Amino acid sequence: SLQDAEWYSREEVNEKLRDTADGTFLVRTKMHGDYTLTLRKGGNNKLIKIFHRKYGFSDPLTVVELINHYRNESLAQYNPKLDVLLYPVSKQQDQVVKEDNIEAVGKKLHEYNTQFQEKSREYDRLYEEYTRTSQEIQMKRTAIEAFNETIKIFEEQCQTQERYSKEYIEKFKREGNEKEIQRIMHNYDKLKSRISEIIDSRRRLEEDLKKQAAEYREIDKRMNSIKPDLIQLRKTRDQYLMWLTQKGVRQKKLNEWL
C-alpha cells in the first residue's frame, strides 16, 4: 500500500503534471532528502520535500499519513503562500476499454499513435499555410499602397500636362493647331486610359485579398478544430502507454507499435 499508493524522475513527472488543473499532485539523490510532493498550481510546479529520520515537511513531524490529511486541507497554514491537494490524479484503467489482453492494448497504442501522428502532420501543414498566407496577405496590402501611390503619380501627371499643354494651345494656336494639339491630346488620352488600367489592376488585387483573407480564416478555423482532437488523442495515448508500463516493463517492445 505504501508502494501501491495510487499517487505514489523530475522530467517525466512534469509530463504527467502537464495540462492538469490547479490542485493536482503526486509523490516522487538519496542524500538531499527522501520523497518529494510535486503539487501543480496554475501552470507551475511546486516541489515540497518529505524529510524522514516520522515523515514531514519541517517542524510538525507527527508517507500515506501525511498526504491524506492535506487532501482535505490547504497548505497555507504550513507555509504562507500556498492557498491551494484536491486532484490526486494518478489512477489509467478507468477507460482503455478495460482491455486485459495486454497485446491488444499494445495494438491500440499504435492505432492512436498513427491517428495522432497523422493529425500532427495536418496540424503542421496548416500552420505553414497560415504563416505563408499572413505573408501573401501583407505583401498584397503593401502592393495596394504602391498601386495607389503609383496612380497618384499618374493622376498628377495627367494634371501636370493640363497646366503646360493648355498654356501651349492658347499661346500661338494657329501655328499647327490641328497638327500640334492632336499629338498633345493623344499623349493625354494615352495617359488617362493608363490610369484607367492601373485602377483596374489594383481593384483586381483587392478582390483577391478578400479571397485570401477568406481562406486565411478557414485555415485558423480548421486549426482550432484539429487542436482539441490532437490533445485528447495524445492524452489517451499517454494513458494507453501508462497502462502497459504498469504491468510489464517491456520498454524496448514499445518501439514497433510506436
Binding site: 502537464r18 516541489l47 499513435n113 478544430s225
Partner: protein, 1060 residues
Amino acid sequence: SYYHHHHHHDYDIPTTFQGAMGSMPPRPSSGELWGIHLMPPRILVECLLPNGMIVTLECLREATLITIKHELFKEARKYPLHQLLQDESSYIFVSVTQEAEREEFFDETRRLCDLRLFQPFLKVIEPVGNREEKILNREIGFAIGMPVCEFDMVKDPEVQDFRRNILNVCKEAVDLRDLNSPHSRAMYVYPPNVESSPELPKHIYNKLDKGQIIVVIWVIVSPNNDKQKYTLKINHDCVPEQVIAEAIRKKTRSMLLSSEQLKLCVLEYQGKYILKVCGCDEYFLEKYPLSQYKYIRSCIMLGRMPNLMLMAKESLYSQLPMDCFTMPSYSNGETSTKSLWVINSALRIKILCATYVNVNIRDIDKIYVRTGIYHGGEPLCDNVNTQRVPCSNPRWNEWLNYDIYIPDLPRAARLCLSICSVEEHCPLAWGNINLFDYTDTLVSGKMALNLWPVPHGLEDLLNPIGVTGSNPNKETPCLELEFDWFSSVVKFPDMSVIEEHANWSVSREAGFSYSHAGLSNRLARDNELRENDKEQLKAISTRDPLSEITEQEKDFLWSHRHYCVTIPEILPKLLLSVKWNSRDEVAQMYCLVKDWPPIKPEQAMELLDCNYPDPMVRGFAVRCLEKYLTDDKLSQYLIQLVQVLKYEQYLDNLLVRFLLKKALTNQRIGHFFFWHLKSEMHNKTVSQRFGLLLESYCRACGMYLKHLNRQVEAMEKLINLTDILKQEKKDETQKVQMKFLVEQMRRPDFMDALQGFLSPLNPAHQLGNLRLEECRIMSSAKRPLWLNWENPDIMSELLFQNNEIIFKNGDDLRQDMLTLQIIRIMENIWQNQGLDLRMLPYGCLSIGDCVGLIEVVRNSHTIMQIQCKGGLKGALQFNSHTLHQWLKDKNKGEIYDAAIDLFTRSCAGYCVATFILGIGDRHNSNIMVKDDGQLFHIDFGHFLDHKKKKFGYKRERVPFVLTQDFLIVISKGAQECTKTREFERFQEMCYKAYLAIRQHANLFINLFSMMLGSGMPELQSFDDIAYIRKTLALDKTEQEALEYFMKQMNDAHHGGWTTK
C-alpha cells in the same frame, strides 16, 4: 485478401502534395518587379517627364539609369513641349518601389533590375531635399530591407524615444575609434583574431621544439610580382613586433653592413610594418603571443608552417576610409504623480470583447478568456472569466479579480491571457502585456490586443514565455480590454524609495520575536549559522538550472540570503527563491543585487533568460559582461545574446546598449551582429525591435555599411535565382536548369552583384571573380547552389586560390547553426582542458527565412561515396573494410599511424557530442571522412530528440552507432576489433570526453535556455531542453553517470563497454 477488400473512398490521386517530391518549402518573397522574379531581358518603361509627357522606352533589364536617362532625353526631342525641358543633368529619376515608398534614384550607375520597381516606370524631377547626402538613408534601408521612412511615421513614443536615445551609444563608439587614429581605426576594422587564453594545451606544446615554431615571413619589392621568403624559427610566445624585427634582420644582414649598422637599420625599419596573414584580410595588430592568434594555433595543430606578410603600415592606413558619423535628422511627467505603493486596492482587469474568433460552432461548445499575472512564474492564483456568449460575437463585460494588492506588483509584471475552447480545454489564441510601460507608468485605460496563434509544441493554455506585446498581423483575434483608472498616472517607485523600504524591512526583522510559525522564511541563527547549513547552500549552488528548487530549499535560501553573498554563483537560485509578489521581499533583493559580487559570464547569462525578467537583475547580468566577457567570448555566445533581446520588456535597455556599443567597437562582432538581426527580420515577433536596432548599427558602423549593402545584394540575387529554379524550372532536367543558371549568372547585373564582395561566413575571406565552370547546382531537391570564387588576395596561392561556399534556399539553417556552435564550444572545452578530440564545426549562417550559407570542406566524402567508389563490379554487397582500404590509399607510412589517431580522436568526440545533443540518426550519407582521416557529421536535422514528440518518452537514443566499418579503422585492421588496445584507448577518450561535457552541463543547459527566444520548434519550452539533463545524467553521481553512459553505449553496439 491483402486489405480485406476495404476501399478508401475519399482517396483521390489526380493532383490529389507536400509529400510527392517531398522537399523545399520556404516561400514566398518577391524580387525584381511586382509579381515576377526576374524582369524580361528587354522591357518597356514609361518615363514620366516634367512637361507631363509619357514617352515609353524599350530598354534592357540590365540598363543603367545613366544609359536610360541619356536615351530618354534623346527620345523626348521627338515628343511635344521639348523646349519646356531642362538639360538632362538637371534631373533625377524617381519611382514607386516594392516597399511602397517613392525612392529618388541618386546613384545613377544602378540598373533597372536592381531597383525593385513594383511597376516598370520612372518619373523625372529636379533634386528636392537639397541635402542629398542625407537621403542616403536608402543605404541603411537596403541593408535593413525596410525603408527608414517607415519608422519616421510610427506613432508609438517608445520607438521614437528609442531612436533618439540610442544615439548616445553610437557617438561613444565612434569616439572610441577615432582616438589613436589611424591605429585604432584599423583596430576597429581588423581586430586581432585571438584565442581567449595565452596558456597553451600540453598536446599543442609538444608539437614544438620545447616552444619553437618555424614561420615564413613574406615581403615584396617591384612592381609586385616577386616576393621573398624569410623563414624564421622564433619562440611560440613572442609578439608580432619581435617577429617583424627578426624578418628585417635576416632581410637586411649583409657583408657590407657591420653588426651595429644592422641594429641601427633595424630600428628605423621596424615599426613601419605590421604582419598580415597571407591569403585573407587578417592582421596581427597587438601584443599577443603568436600562439594566441587563432591562425597560428590552427597552423600548429594542422602541421603547417605559418605564412605571414610584411605589410607597410601606410599601405594599410591607405585602405581605411574615414567613418564620418553624422547625427540624424531626428536629432517629462507631471510631478508628484504616485508611488504605486499609495494605491489601496486589489488588481482587477476588464475583459470586453474578442472580435475575430475563427471556430467551428459544430465542433466546440463554449469559449472563454483565461488570464493570469506573471514574472516568468505567476504572482497569484490564475483565473478565467465565465463561459459566456460562446462562439458567436464573444462578449463578456466582466472585471476579473486578481488576488494581489497593486503595490505588490513587481516592476517586471505581465498579464498573460488566452482565449480558450471547451474537460475539453484548448487554447485558440494568446497574448501578453507588460503591466507597466517603458516610462515606469502602470497600465490604466483601454488596450486592444491582437493575438498570436497557438504554436506547435504548446499544449498549455496560457504561454507566458511568449513575447510581450500585440501581434502586428491585424486580421487575427483582437481581444480589447480595460484596466482600472486611478485618477492619476501611477508610476513605479524610485530606487531611492525602494532602498529605504528595504532598509526598514530589515530592521523590522531584527525585532520580530523568538518562536515564529513559518520561521522557514527568516534566520533565527543570527551571525552564527550551522556548519551543516553552510555546506547545503554550496550544494544547491552546484546544481544545474533545470533541477528545480523545492519550497523548503527556496525558503531556506531566502532566509540565509545575506550569507549567499559569500557564494555569488548561488544568485540565480536565490532570485527564483524570492516571493516577487511581496515588495517587502523584492525591495531587499534589489539591495542585495545592487552590490552583489560580479560573476563569470557563462553563469551571468542564465540571468538574461525568460526566468529573470527584472531590470535590476538583468542590469547586474550586463554589469558582469562589461567586466569579464572578452571580445572573443562575446562573439562565441553572440547568437545566444541577440536571441535573448526578445526577453527584454522595452526597446531601450542596458543589454541592447551593451551589444550595440560592442558591435561598433569591433567590426568582426558587428558583421555577425548585423546578420543575426537581419536573419530574424522576417519574424514579426522582432521585426520592429531588430529593425530599429539595425538602423542604429548601420548609421554608426562607418564604411562597412557599404560592404554589407554589397553582401546584402549578393544574397538577394541568389534568393531570386534559386526561387525561380525552385518554381518555374522544377520538372526540368539538371541539364536544362544548369543552362538556365549559367545563362543568368553571365548577365552583367549578376556579374556585378555576385563578384566583388566579402564572404558573410567570414568577412576576412574576400570573393573575387566567379568561376562559373566550377559553379553548379547540387543534386538535392532544394536546389542548393555550389558557388565558387577566385580568392583575389596577393597570396591566394599561399592559403586557397579558390573559395567556395554553398548557398541553400529551402532549409531552416538555424538548428544546424546552433548544434555546430554547440560542437565548437564542446571542442574548446575538451581541448583547452587538455584532451585532443577534433570536431570540425564547419561554418553555417542563416541570412533570412530558410536561406543560408554553408562552408564547403574540400577533400571530404560521405562514407557512401567512399563505399560507392570502393565497391566491386558485381552489385552484391559492399565490403566493411573499404573505408579502411580507402583511408590507407590516402595515408601511407608513418602518415597512416597518425591518420588513424585522428580518425580515432574525431570519432570519439563526435560520438559523445552526438549522444549528448541527441541529434538525428547518423548513417552513411550524413557522415563524412576527410583524406587525412578526420571524421565529421553533417546534416544534423533536428537536435534534442525532437522526434520524441511522436511517442518518445525514455528513448535516450544513441544516434552514432559505430558499425564494423568504423571499428576496423580504429583498430588498424584486425579481426574482432572490439578487443584491442586501439579500441581500449578509444573508449577511454569517450569516457573522459563525456565527463568533461558533464562538468560544464550548466553552460550547455543555459545556452539552450537562451535559445527558447527563437521560434525553433525544437526549442519550445524548458522540457525540450530537459533531454540534455537525462543524457548527461545530472541526477546521479559521476560514477553512476559513467556506468549509465557505458550501459547506453553498450546496448546500441551489443557488447564492448564495461571494465575500469
